[PDB]
A paper describes a structure:
However, we were successful in performing structural study of a newly discovered bacterial RNA repair complex consisting of three proteins named Pnkp1, Rnl and Hen1, which form a heterohexamer in vitro. Since the newly found RNA repair system possesses elements of both T4 and Pnkp–Hen1 RNA repair systems, it can be regarded as a hybrid RNA repair system. Therefore, the Pnkp1–Rnl–Hen1 heterohexamer is likely the functional unit of a new bacterial RNA repair system in vivo. Because the Pnkp1–Rnl–Hen1 RNA heterohexamer possesses two identical copies of each enzymatic activity, a total of eight active sites are present in the complex, same as in the RNA repair complex of the Pnkp–Hen1 heterotetramer.
To provide insight into the mechanism of RNA repair by the Pnkp1–Rnl–Hen1 heterohexamer, we soaked crystals with adenosine triphosphate (ATP) before data collection, which resulted in a crystal structure with cofactors occupying all active sites. Guided by the locations of these cofactors, and aided by the published structural homologues of Pnkp1 and Hen1 in complex with nucleic acids as well as the model of RNA in complex with the ligase module of Pnkp–Hen1, we manually docked short single-stranded RNAs into the four active sites located in the inner rim of one ring structure. The docking model shows that, while the reacting ends of single-stranded RNAs (not observed in Fig. 6a) are placed in the active site, the opposite ends point to a vacant space at the centre of the ring structure, indicating that a RNA substrate approaches each repair unit from this vacant space for RNA repair. The 5′ end of the damaged RNA would first enter the kinase site for phosphorylation and, at the same time, the 3′-end of the damaged RNA would go into the phosphatase site for dephosphorylation. Because of highly efficient 5′-phosphorylation carried out by the kinase domain of Pnkp1, the 5′ end would be the first to enter the ligase site, where it could be activated with 5′-adenylation by RNA ligase. On the other hand, after 3′-dephosphorylation carried out by the phosphatase domain of Pnkp1, the 3′ end could make a detour to the methyltransferase site of Hen1 for 2′-O-methylation before joining the 5′ end in the ligase site. With the presence of both processed ends in the ligase site, RNA ligation occurs, which results in repaired RNA with 2′-O-methylation. Among the four active sites located on the inner rim of the same ring structure, the kinase and phosphatase active sites are from one unit of the Pnkp1–Rnl–Hen1 heterotrimer, and the methyltransferase and ligase active sites are contributed from the other unit. Our structure revealed that the methyltransferase site is located between the phosphatase and ligase sites, providing the 3′ end of the damaged RNA maximal opportunity to be 2′-O-methylated after dephosphorylation but before ligation.
Numbering used by the authors:
A (entry chain A): 4 to 123, 142 to 312
B (entry chain D): 4 to 122, 145 to 312
C (entry chain F): 219 to 377, 390 to 436
D (entry chain E): 2 to 394
Write the structure that this text describes.
Amino acid sequence: KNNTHHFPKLLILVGAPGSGKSTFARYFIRTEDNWVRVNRDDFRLMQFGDSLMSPFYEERITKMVEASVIALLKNRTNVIIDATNSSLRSLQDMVHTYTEYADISFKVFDLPVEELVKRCHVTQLQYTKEKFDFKPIPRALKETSLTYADQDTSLPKAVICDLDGTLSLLNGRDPYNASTADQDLLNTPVAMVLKMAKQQGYKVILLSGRENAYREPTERFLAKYQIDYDLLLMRDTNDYRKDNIIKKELFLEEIQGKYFVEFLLDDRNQVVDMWRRELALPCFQVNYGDF
Amino acid sequence: KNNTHHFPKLLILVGAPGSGKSTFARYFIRTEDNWVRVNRDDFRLMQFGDSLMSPFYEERITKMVEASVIALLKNRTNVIIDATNSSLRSLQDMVHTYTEYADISFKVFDLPVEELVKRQLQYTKEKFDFKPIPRALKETSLTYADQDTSLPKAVICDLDGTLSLLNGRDPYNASTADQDLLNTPVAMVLKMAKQQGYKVILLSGRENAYREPTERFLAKYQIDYDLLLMRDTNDYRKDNIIKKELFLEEIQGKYFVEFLLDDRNQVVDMWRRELALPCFQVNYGDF
Amino acid sequence: KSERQFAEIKPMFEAYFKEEGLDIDFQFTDTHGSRMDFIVKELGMEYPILDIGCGELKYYRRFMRRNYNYSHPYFATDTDKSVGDYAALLKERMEADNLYFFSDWTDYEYKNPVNIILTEVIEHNTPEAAEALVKHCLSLNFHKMIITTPNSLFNKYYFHFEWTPQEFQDFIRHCVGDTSLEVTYCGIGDRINGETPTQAVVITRK
Amino acid sequence: EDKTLIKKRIDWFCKNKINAFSPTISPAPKSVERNEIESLYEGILWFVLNGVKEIVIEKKYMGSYCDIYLHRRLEDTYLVSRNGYKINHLDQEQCLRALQGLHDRFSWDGVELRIIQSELMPWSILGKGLINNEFSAYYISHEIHAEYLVQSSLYEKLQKIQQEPAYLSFVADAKVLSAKELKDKYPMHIIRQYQSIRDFKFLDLPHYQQNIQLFKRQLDIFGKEAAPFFKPFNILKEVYTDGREHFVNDNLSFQQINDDDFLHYQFTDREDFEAKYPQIRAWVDQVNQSDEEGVVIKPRTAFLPGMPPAFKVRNNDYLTLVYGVDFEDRLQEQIAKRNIKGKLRCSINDWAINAKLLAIPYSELGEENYELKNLVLDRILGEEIENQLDSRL
Ligand SMILES: Nc1ncnc2c1ncn2[C@@H]1O[C@H](COP(=O)(O)OP(=O)(O)OP(=O)(O)O)[C@@H](O)[C@H]1O
Ligand SMILES: Nc1ncnc2c1ncn2[C@@H]1O[C@H](COP(=O)(O)OP(=O)(O)OP(=O)(O)O)[C@@H](O)[C@H]1O
Ligand SMILES: Nc1ncnc2c1ncn2[C@@H]1O[C@H](COP(=O)(O)OP(=O)(O)OP(=O)(O)O)[C@@H](O)[C@H]1O
Ligand SMILES: Nc1ncnc2c1ncn2[C@@H]1O[C@H](CSCC[C@H](N)C(=O)O)[C@@H](O)[C@H]1O
Ligand SMILES: [Mg+2]
Ligand SMILES: [Mg+2]
Ligand SMILES: [Mg+2]
């Protein structure tokens, strides 16, 4: 080390109603330099209402709060956050959700209940059981501990390639109508992997989210660009379930336990997540997904 | 094919202050099922702002309006927007930014200014036409940069998070990098890489100071490599720009890049959207 | 109100009806669902199913809070414009993710094997277009098909058409004719001197 | 509240061009003082205490709330109910016939509609069967029961036992010793019998009958059938052909839209009333002897902010239809369980919504007026909530 390196800050205001956290913040964002406030209550005011809502709404408000904080923290904007939360399951969670993006800090607002209900309510004390110790928590990463899955190394070496948008760019084509798929263009770098792949003992298995009905226009595309493959695995005709569901079935039924997958090449996120997160397998992501 | 897929609905309420859009959306939320409001004004209020602020706040607000809308659409949730803009196309950005994500609908609240100030003018004024757009897509090919296909064909590979698993090391103190771990499938790529006419080139953010413990890690796992470009010791600036530089000095126009294995986002973007090179991204890297 | 409670009263009511000259086997669940139970049990959860004739009741049941892990998709069809529109409203992502609803039979393309449900249907709407629908279904690549209709002999006991068994049995015979199906019959619901209120066939392809 | 089916209802309120809903009405506040459960006095005094200088007194009619949408073309008028619905299951001929009383009292040059709130008469035009199933059934039961008690030797034998020395011995040495012993009165054998007697509710049989008969008499007046007619009482607003509208805001409109029926009009401001109360009470008691449900009191101008639209005073005779045959007797106990608030809380909201509704111009009603739709649902909630009240007020 030796070096200076700084990340934005997330300042979590922790405390009860009336305890003066929104007042501090109004002063704070007005005098400090690069700060944005995020209030949960202000959010559920776009949806019209007083500050408790449907477990539908509150789950959606969470989805938004988190997105925004991350959105900003990513932008190197400091974020103060008005935790009406106050618990521990909240706090520890809050910390999990955030620290990796920025340096967390805390500011408590304790205040005698005799004084607290004099900010005019509903006479209700909260879970203030001075826990956790509110020591600042610098940014932490957690994950360079990559651990795959214990696949039988007796089974024959094999790689796995997505077709749509990984070995075969659409070039305008309709995503769901892969009949016109012999016009498709080659993502040569992936093509080049599959080449050198089969130069070592590697079985090359094509696994695709195309209707099986479009098998023929596919085999055309493949032999047109001279792709040397072992299996061609395709989605059942009239299936239409999500990609990762039908690909995973395909994986477990066929590939699984019959081969030893050395890695996978794919494009869209939904699928990459499944491969990595559910099946615990190395998968390289070739372009950008987020379809 | 005929399955058809169904996407969330984003509904822009176009009108000018007083119209009726926020009163519609009030009824529209309480009566419809899966719908959330996203109003730019309530975000200002979150910063303690009357209306209109520093271009700073305005810009940072925007970054979290798009955040909160996309975050919702991806949770498959219909989203309504009180477009307090409706400008001579401030609508098109709004449409270009989202159409990737949802079926876009409009509902213009037109009202004569004599009635509109039941509390001046507001120009219509357009060839816009409010046709409900489906979902979009695009990014329909890859502009892989014209490369001199005569230079020795070679591949490029990050160390940290790609080939070298930290196993909980200090990512800034690479002195112990020799007791680090191998991401075998990444290494398996470099193995077959060599055996084909490829020069394997390494390229790191490790300051040169920690080169000994690097070369040891490589020898230990018997990694076969041709170059090893690193960070100038005590350079300490953005990981991203260092590699960018090293490339344009050492590798650019001196080899032929077939692809790059990398891990951290900041970098993968640089490869794909600045230098227009192919870049396979092993595993997740959000920092 | 309880199954256990029902267990103690059952023999009593049953014995009472013997002396009146009636063997009755009383059942707690109610003909419907007494039936829907039988179907779910019989088919199983290992093939995707084809739900011919549906307000949605059979679909929810195939999902039961993930308790039955339904891996496949779910094919469902119906003529009622009502049902179709309700099927639509479910593709406003009130779940129904693996629901393909189709109206024209030339829209069912799935070339893979399927388990089939002819809920009530072959009477309580169409008549001898039954010969049609049942014969069309038999051509489909299926594993197991279940058909249910009223017993008509059961009408004695209450207060479109309706076949007796034998009437029904003939219908099935003259739809399989000569193909290598295996076919077994049985009844569902309260039984009185042999007759239940709904008839059943379990057709399995050898 | 089911959203997919409230969405339904609201669309109808819009489709049908309805321009107003309705108030609930709270009874007059207690008078533990005068033992009148709905106090003519304490209900007028409540108003002067809150700023009325002029109030009006209308007879309260026994029918069903019906907003009349009088069009100049009498042929195309319609009737909306207590809540948001059109009434069209009446003889729209026979109805229009009764409405011409009202129609011919006006001048419709340049006036195209006149929204008038009235009582559709009589009770059984929509309420019969609720009359048959509930009310006449309560009556008959009690009347049958009373026949039995009178014809039957029952009450007699009980009274004879209640005299014997075996009993009484029991009721004394048991009023003083507590569930004891055992009460070696043969088990339980006696402890049952003599305990069940004594705890038997005797009834002043004649008084039980007189009570039953008052119920009958009342039910006979209001509850008998039934050639449709109207008792109009307030003009909500007048709608001109020339676009413009006139928000009436006057309950005294009354003496114009029908009802040459005696109302009255007093200026009781700042307790020169009390000396004014004896005349208003003197006439209302003429009204009650005169076979009516009771009386309603309203601020002379229909809408006042933060106010209820009215107070009702149902006489005690009529109230025996509401409470048992024995309201007369257990008068005090129920003055106690009573709280005019809650009603009054809703009674102000309903009216105050109703006026922001009436506020929307006739031309604008529809499914594209989301201010309409908001006010409605708001009003609809008010229903869902107000219905959960005592439901005897
Ligand atoms: N030191 C103080 N002295 C007097 N009044 C104060 C002080 N601090 C805050 N207040 C007042 O107390 C009231 C509540 O404060 P504030 O709005 O900060 O509550 P809060 O903690 O944000 O509650 P919520 O969770 O509802 O946002 C405000 O009206 C504020 O003006
Ligand atoms: N159709 C309508 N008829 C009558 N009044 C209406 C109607 N629509 C809205 N209003 C009233 O107009 C007032 C302000 O309108 P509204 O709140 O809808 O403006 P807005 O669309 O929110 O504009 P902005 O959000 O840009 O400020 C509110 O008091 C509301 O009750
Ligand atoms: N002169 C009048 N002015 C206003 N309302 C009257 C008049 N005469 C009769 N009514 C009726 O009396 C109603 C309230 O009295 P009543 O107790 O008979 O009905 P209700 O069932 O209590 O109505 P709610 O339960 O909605 O209060 C009014 O809604 C109206 O229908
Ligand atoms: N030829 C046909 N094709 C598709 N549906 C048919 C049909 N003939 C009759 N039907 C349908 O069969 C249905 C039976 S109702 C289904 C019963 C069962 N309780 C369940 O919920 O599943 C009706 O809705 C009717 O429209
Ligand atoms: Mg793909
Ligand atoms: Mg890296
Ligand atoms: Mg009445």
